[PDB]
């Protein structure tokens, strides 16, 4: 009715404060709202997609506008290695005088924040040189956000709402996505690179007024049409190019030298355009696959129904998977989040391994922040994929449709899967903790020579097979006169070998026993998080303790204290438990990356190689040592520009600590406390005339777990980000 | 002159806008059928 949860009649009649909390918390759960049909659900999701896309482009336009208005892009272009990039200007009426002088840094004269997101290098590579270019990009993205908001409004109109058959058109949507949204966009980016970014790297000034009359190549469409495509690769940029200017430059637009530009320590811009062109052609061909309207093409139902091994090896094969995926939005979303989590972990690895933006791998602060950023986001997406698979099992899985399916057999032998994940996790934890404690006791007792240090020969063999030639394995690419080393010897090999065998890059960092131990720790974390998530997903439909768990839904508090006790029995509680393990393993990964790069950037990799084998070495050489510039941001003798990072460090500590409130103390204590406070307010004079509308009650059990988990996570992020930024900023190496 | 816009917009937005939104949201919460 007129009450706030208009979508839930059950919540609107709640006389307590639980109504507001649950109405806020269940606003986006479009499947369970009152009187919801499938078509209306799909239309609302389409409109929400448009609104979210507009939010993304508004955020990017805001970044562009703030760098254009309050930034030092003009000064940073002229000297990228010595000028600090600027995020935006600071307005604070709470500042003292010394805070105003302390935050006044860079070339500007106002208090200011130094950008650690690397947007300066990215825009500098793609041809931005002035503040007007950034402002025009901000205007374009503002107009795009306006257009997307209008489109979202338009597709909820009665004559423009698409039908349910339009949404479930898998072949047409995948054809158009794979061809257009991937290949045509990659082709357009290759065109932008060749027309603007490559000439800007060579000193030419190409903008909207002269791009249509300036030839990107001296010949121009003659090597392409005649078939002499190798003319575009001749005369590349020499190894004296000096980015942004024209001395030692070339006239090539599509090359595959491989390796790094010698000055910017990033990949060649002509390699990237060639890469994008190849990906464009491949994606257009791949989008030419599924039957839409012209006879040719596949049917996705027939491919899935055909793939049955001959004699019952996988049951009934993939029969019925087409009907389950199309009719369940939770399975599609789970597949999307799993793939996106793999993708953003891949970008996290490859942007430090193979930097593409000019004059990165020398800032080190953007280099740390981007990696930690993308790894934490990867962990979040990975947990969400399994959470939505559990939701799909709870309220979207049809057992009769999936009879003897490849999906039902997963539930058939779920006990074997959970038990073997248990065995792997227990084995890894036992052994890597035993090795770490052994090294701790051996170093503590004055005998570091008694440590168990396993040399990581498999990954070192992989590095040698990629071309690294200090391990002395002499195999494949590391050994000349080999088939792999000869076949590519005149396309991309010399640049790759001169980039992999130098000590200034992050390509295939030299690894020792500490790398072995911490990789085993990472495998432990991955296997245990997978254990919790897979067990929750597979036991979401029921177990021995609760055979009818599907009747109670995905998220419910418990099943009472009977038959032993049923605390944390739902699949939502399995998500809640696996969130801690994801945070733990991402913290392990980021600690390993940050300490290894802190020792490599300072030219002191021996410190990591000697102190990473035992836990006290970590504790006293990474965390205790690198906190000194952070915690000294403000003290009894004054303050500097890292005072905000010290304050945020303590802030994240306090939020992480007050999560333990909701995680350890449970409802009953607080409900009785609330009842005493209710008596207090009702029975005091003057103040009893002020009467509440909603009866105050304690937070519910699932709500309390969510609030404590959100506190734990926010405190986790807000205590790791200031450390990983200020410790790198406080050392410059 | 664009040196006035922080000191104008930041208090207006950050203080005045969410206060009115909190009051409006509370009123919309407590209205009934």
């Amino acid at each position: 009715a007129t009450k706030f949860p208009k979508f839930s009649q059950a919540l609107a009649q709640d006389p307590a404060t639980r109504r507001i909390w649950y109405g806020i918390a269940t606003a986006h759960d479009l499947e369970s709202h009152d009187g919801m049909t499938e078509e209306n659900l799909y239309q609302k999701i389409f409109a929400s997609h448009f609104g979210h896309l507009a939010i993304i482009f508004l955020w990017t336009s805001g970044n562009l506008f703030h760098v254009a208005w309050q930034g030092n892009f003009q000064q940073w272009v002229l000297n990228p290695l010595k000028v600090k990039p600027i995020a935006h200007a600071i307005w604070d009426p709470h500042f003292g005088q010394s805070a105003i002088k302390a935050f006044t840094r860079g070339g500007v004269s106002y208090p200011v924040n130094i950008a650690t997101s690397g947007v300066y290098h990215w825009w500098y590579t793609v041809g931005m040189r002035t503040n007007e270019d950034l402002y025009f990009g901000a205007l374009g993205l503002l107009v795009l956000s306006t257009t997307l908001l209008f489109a979202g409004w338009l597709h909820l109109q009665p004559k423009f709402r698409p039908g349910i058959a339009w949404f479930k058109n898998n072949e047409s949507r995948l054809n158009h996505h794979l061809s257009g949204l991937f290949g045509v966009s990659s082709l357009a980016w290759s065109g932008h690179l060749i027309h603007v970014a490559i000439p800007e790297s060579r000193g030419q000034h190409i903008r909207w007024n002269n791009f249509t009359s300036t030839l990107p190549h001296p010949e121009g469409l003659t090597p392409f049409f005649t078939g002499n495509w190798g003319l575009y690769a001749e005369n590349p940029d020499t190894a004296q190019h000096i980015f942004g200017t024209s001395e030692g430059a070339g006239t090539a637009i599509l090359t595959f030298l491989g390796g790094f530009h010698p000055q910017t320590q990033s990949m060649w811009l002509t390699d990237i355009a060639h890469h994008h062109l190849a990906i464009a052609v491949v994606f257009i061909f791949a989008g030419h696959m599924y039957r839409t309207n012209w006879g040719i093409g596949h049917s996705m139902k027939e491919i899935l129904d055909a793939h049955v091994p001959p004699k019952g090896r996988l049951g009934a094969g993939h029969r019925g998977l087409f009907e389950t995926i199309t009719d369940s939005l939770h399975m599609q979303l789970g597949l999307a989040l799993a793939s996106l989590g793999v993708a953003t972990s891949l970008v996290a690895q490859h942007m430090y391994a193979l930097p593409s933006y000019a004059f990165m791998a020398k800032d080190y602060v953007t280099q740390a922040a981007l990696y930690t950023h993308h790894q934490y986001i990867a962990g979040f997406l990975m947990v969400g994929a399994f959470a939505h698979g559990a939701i799909f099992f709870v309220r979207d899985y049809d057992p009769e449709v999936n009879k003897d399916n490849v999906l039902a057999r997963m539930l058939q032998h779920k006990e074997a899967i959970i038990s073997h994940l248990s065995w792997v996790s227990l084995f890894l934890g036992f052994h890597t903790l035993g090795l770490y404690i052994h090294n701790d006791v051996c170093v503590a007792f004055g005998t570091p020579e008694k440590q168990i240090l396993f040399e990581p020969v498999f990954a070192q063999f992989i590095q040698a097979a990629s071309g690294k030639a200090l391990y002395g394995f002499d195999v494949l690419l590391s050994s000349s006169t080999s088939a792999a080393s000869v076949a590519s010897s005149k396309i991309w090999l010399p640049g790759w070998m001169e980039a992999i065998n130098s000590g200034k890059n992050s390509l295939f960092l030299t690894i020792g026993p500490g790398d072995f131990l911490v990789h085993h720790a990472i495998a432990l974390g991955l296997h245990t998080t997978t254990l919790i998530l897979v067990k929750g997903a597979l036991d979401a439909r029921g177990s021995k303790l609760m055979p009818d768990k599907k009747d109670f839904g995905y998220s419910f508090p418990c099943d009472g204290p009977g038959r032993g006790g049923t605390c944390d029995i739902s699949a939502w509680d399995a998500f809640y438990l696996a969130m801690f393990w994801m945070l733990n393993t991402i913290s392990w990964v980021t600690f390993y990356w940050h300490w290894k790069h802190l020792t490599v950037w300072g030219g002191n990799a021996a410190a990591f190689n000697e102190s990473s084998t035992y836990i006290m070495g970590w504790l006293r050489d990474y965390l205790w040592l690198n906190s000194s510039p952070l915690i000294n941001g403000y003290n009894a003798f004054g303050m500097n520009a890292q005072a905000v990072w010290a304050w945020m460090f303590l802030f994240g500590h306090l939020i992480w600590a007050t999560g333990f409130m909701f995680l350890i103390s449970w409802r009953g204590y607080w409900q009785e406390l609330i009842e005493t406070l209710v008596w207090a307010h009702e029975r005091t004079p003057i103040a009893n005339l002020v009467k509440w509308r909603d009866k105050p009650v304690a937070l519910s059990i699932v709500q309390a777990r969510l609030v404590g988990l959100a506190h734990f996570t926010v405190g986790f992020i807000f205590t790791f980000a200031p450390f990983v930024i200020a410790s790198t900023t406080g050392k410059f190496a | 002159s664009a040196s006035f816009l922080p000191s104008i917009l930041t208090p207006v937005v950050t203080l005045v806008f969410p206060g009115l939104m909190f009051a409006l949201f509370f009123v919309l919460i407590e209205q009934e059928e």
């Binding site: 706030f4 208009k6 609302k44 409109a47 929400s48 448009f50 609104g51 507009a54 508004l58 506008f65 254009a68 208005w69 503040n131 007007e132 402002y135 901000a138 205007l139 503002l142 107009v143 956000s145 306006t146 908001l149 209008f150 979202g152 409004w153 909820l156 | 002159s1 664009a2 816009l5 919309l28």
Partner: peptide, 30 residues
């Protein structure tokens, strides 16, 4: 250097985007 007229033009575009955002949010409605 970004002139004041450019900033006010961007503010006008953002205001139009705000009105369309209100329209979309009230088309999904509560």
């Amino acid at each position: 250097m970004i002139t004041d007229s450019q900033i006010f033009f961007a503010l006008c575009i953002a205001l139009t985007a705000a009105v369309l955002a209100i329209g979309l949010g009230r088309q999904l409605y509560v």
